[PDB]
Amino acid sequence: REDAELLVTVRGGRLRGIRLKTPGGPVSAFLGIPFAEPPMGPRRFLPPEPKQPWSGVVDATTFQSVCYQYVDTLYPGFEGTEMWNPNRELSEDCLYLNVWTPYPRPTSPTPVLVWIYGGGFYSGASSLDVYDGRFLVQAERTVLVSMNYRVGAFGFLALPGSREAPGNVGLLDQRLALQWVQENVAAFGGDPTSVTLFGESAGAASVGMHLLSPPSRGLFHRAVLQSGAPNGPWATVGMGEARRRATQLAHLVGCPPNDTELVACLRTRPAQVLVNHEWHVLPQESVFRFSFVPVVDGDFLSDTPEALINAGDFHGLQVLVGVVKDEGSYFLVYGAPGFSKDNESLISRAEFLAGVRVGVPQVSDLAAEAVVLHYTDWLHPEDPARLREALSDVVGDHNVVCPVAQLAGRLAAQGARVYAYVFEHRASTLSWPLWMGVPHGYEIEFIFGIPLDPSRNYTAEEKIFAQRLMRYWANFARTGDPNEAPQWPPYTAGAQQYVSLDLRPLEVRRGLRAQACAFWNRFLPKLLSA
Amino acid sequence: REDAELLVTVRGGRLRGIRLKTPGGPVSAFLGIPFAEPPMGPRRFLPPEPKQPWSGVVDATTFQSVCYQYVDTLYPGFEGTEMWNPNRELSEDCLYLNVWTPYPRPTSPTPVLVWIYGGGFYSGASSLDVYDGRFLVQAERTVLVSMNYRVGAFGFLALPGSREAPGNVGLLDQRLALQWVQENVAAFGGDPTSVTLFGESAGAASVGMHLLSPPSRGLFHRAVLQSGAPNGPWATVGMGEARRRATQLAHLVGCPPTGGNDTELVACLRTRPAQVLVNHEWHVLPESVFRFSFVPVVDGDFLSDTPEALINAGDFHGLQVLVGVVKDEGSYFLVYGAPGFSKDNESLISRAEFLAGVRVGVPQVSDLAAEAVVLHYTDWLHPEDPARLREALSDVVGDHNVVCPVAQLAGRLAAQGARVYAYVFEHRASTLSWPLWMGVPHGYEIEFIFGIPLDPSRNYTAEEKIFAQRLMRYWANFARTGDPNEAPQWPPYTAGAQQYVSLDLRPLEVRRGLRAQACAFWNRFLPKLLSA
């Protein structure tokens, strides 16, 4: 009758899973495990509360609801945007996590990978097809955990000082799921003493914030930050700006105008109403600059991520960090004048200067003219193809590449063993136009072994390539070293070595855009303060 | 009795010259022609008085005295420094000019080249061997004129507003000589409707200030700016700072016995021996290289606005200019104070010496500005490589002081109506005494433009003599026609294409951009930074 491999007991009660198929063999999956009390009604904006025990058997055979979030509609029906859109019904009752393990369940402790999805802290879900853990788990014999965490106002609205909207509760959802992993992953065969966090974009920034928050640091052992960093300009907000943004959302939804009374009014509004006004609280209208992000209030983050990175002892830490070849291109089609996936986006000088203020919001004009000085080729100041590439650089450098390089350089010089990569393979199945190169987010499907899905159109070399990346990631999870053949050297502040990841063997290079990132990380700070 | 070719009448009276031998035949030289009353005693610091007429024949047969100036002593006996030092006795009686003309005198009017020497406005002389006009005149049949002008405190100490030391008298010395050329160059066979100014370093800056001063602009028709521009950070000074430097010098020498009355102040200065003023000249500065004590002052009179204001406001139609730089403009200056530098070793500096050199080479900018300079000129993949640090500090110093000011001037003249030609001089002389690490240093194109290699007592090789003959032709072609050309072609410089030619033994090679990236930093961004 019942397959014993799919029955598991955890602290809160009993679970029933589902056997899944991969081209390499079966896999055990436990999907939609509740790890928190549903943050509904009076629990909205509040820190998560642990899930109370249940009787009977929770059905963990299918993904659970996606946390309430805005839906991308820029290209309705387009594969490249819909693949990130919610693929289950939206609900505030969304605090569930998923566990994939080998079949039969391992009987000795197995290394655990924990995935935190990105989405600008306003979107995402652990149920997206591209985050399917069945391939990594079968190919590399790890246990894979992913959780949903509250995004948008539901996870990061903050009235600093108040107990009714304290902020960062989306980060506390992540931590609670990390706590759940410590207490329960052993029942699945996982080793709670070998937990590697990994995440992309705002998920990579989340990982970094768990590295810089002592209550989280005891819940995992390694970290992987893909195309994201806690020191990114989009990843945190100050207390005063967070209060301004929260108050502005209240006014926009008909709410006064006392923290207690404003949150109370906010808790009466349907969730979709908060979503619908989310984008209209920002200071300037631009691509980027998400409304509700982690707040630096001296609690979860006792200081800014940049300050905590500079002051940190990181001996005993191994991290894997990296970027795609063209981090900036994907973001340009969301409001940089002249850009479109459906045309070559050959922009004009004036459109270029306009894109700079949109891609680097929040900076003085002297700062913006410093940007256009540095990214203008003064022998070809008006070439449209060069201006397209240069603004892609402006946007990718400022928001992804240079924060990652600053994290990597500081962690390495202060005790961590860091491995750095640049992902340079353009998927043969990629739907975005060729002028975008290798865009943001497009390494994920290879990390998760999606090319091994037989019902997809990846080439045979792309499958070999995916198996190489899964082996790198699992090797790092098992030992803190991706290497097993040309070798991947650690990244250091001086040599600045990284490897290119594509169909060719590893190629070692120097410098994560060192010249450009010297501008963002070393000069531009001094210009803004004085 | 007398050679008729060596006798000339000008407005003030009669002159007798000399017939000079050249490697290519005779030349008539009139050396040491007085063009102003000697600025002695009560006329110290005053504008030049035109020379009063004389009876009899004035012997213009040798170079006259060098205007009082400080004497370089960094490497005593070394040709690389002694070649710029005075080769005549120092005197305040020094306002004389020189005319070289073909022998026999031209029958039809001949275009004139007027040379203005450099020396940071504190040094120089028209009598330096490397300024000998006999080769240019012989090879290209032109009239060449060069003048002495007051330098240091004697030419540029300014108590602005006062009549006893209005400042810029060294520039007025140059203008008086230009006026002399208009009234008198025809008597030597020269064409006063074809006068081409050319000068180097502070001489080039001087040439530019005459472009931007309307009273001077009527006295010439074409300009050549070699390794200098009026808009360079070293070339001008504000009235308040000029008054401060003048007052500190006076104080350093006991005047007054603090400023007070300007007339009282200058009169005390005028009783000090010239050598005393020279000996205290460099103490008046806030130290570094480069910044010079007494330079032209922007005071609304000779310069109605700053040179960069005048350059942007300018309509330059009908003007032809030839501008350029040597290959390594900054290396020569570094051995005069940059820590770790010497002509006698490799000057392979440390990063801390690089950072300290930046403050010395870019003096009087904020720490934020200095940070921006270190960011731009640091290779962040090789931030401490001593050889790259050496070249980078040379680039900092040369771009800031020479290349980028000239590039700003070239692009604004071309955009606002002038025909512009641009060069980079890239031949390191076989006779060069400076070490190899300096490349082609500041000032070492001059000997080739003046045809100095044609001198048989010098050991230039034969291609270098051909090279010197090529450049003399380019320069004289420009003076004649406003275009140095006469296969391969030298295209004009434009704000867009930014084309220039390299000058070395090889044929002409066209290239784009006078360090366009680096100069965008100095000319476009850094001014915005310093206004915030």
Ligand SMILES: *[C@@H]1O[C@H](CO[C@@H]2O[C@@H](C)[C@@H](O)[C@@H](O)[C@@H]2O)[C@@H](O[C@@H]2O[C@H](CO)[C@@H](O)[C@H](O)[C@H]2NC(C)=O)[C@H](O)[C@H]1NC(C)=O
């Ligand atoms: C290169 O030389 C400079 C200057 O030193 C002079 O030149 C040398 C070749 C030698 O002849 C010295 O006797 C001269 O004094 C060196 O910089 C100096 O270093 C000394 C300490 O040794 C210091 O007291 C001076 O202040 C420095 N002066 C300057 C201008 O920096 C430099 O260290 C030498 N670098 C080498 C050896 O490669």
Ligand SMILES: *[C@@H]1O[C@H](CO)[C@@H](O[C@@H]2O[C@H](CO)[C@@H](O)[C@H](O)[C@H]2NC(C)=O)[C@H](O)[C@H]1NC(C)=O
């Ligand atoms: C500074 O001193 C000079 C010289 O004494 C003054 O100039 C003279 O002023 C007197 C009147 O006090 C006149 O009679 C003389 O003809 C002036 N001689 C000149 C012009 O040299 C000058 O007025 C004083 N200026 C001040 C007081 O600032």
Ligand SMILES: NC(=O)c1cc[n+](COC[n+]2ccccc2/C=N/O)cc1
């Ligand atoms: N304003 C928008 O429509 C919007 C919505 C979502 N995103 C980001 O979501 C896409 N995404 C989300 C998570 C991870 C990767 C990616 C994309 N990679 O190319 C951008 C703009």
Ligand SMILES: NC(=O)c1cc[n+](COC[n+]2ccccc2/C=N/O)cc1
């Ligand atoms: N003693 C000094 O500090 C000093 C420094 C520089 N100069 C300038 O004189 C040299 N010079 C004078 C005129 C033209 C060119 C050049 C240099 N070419 O490399 C004089 C004195």
Ligand SMILES: *[C@@H]1O[C@H](CO)[C@@H](O)[C@H](O)[C@H]1NC(C)=O
């Ligand atoms: C693969 O390509 C075929 C067309 O050759 C198309 O019909 C199919 O939908 C594609 N499937 C995937 C997984 O993209």
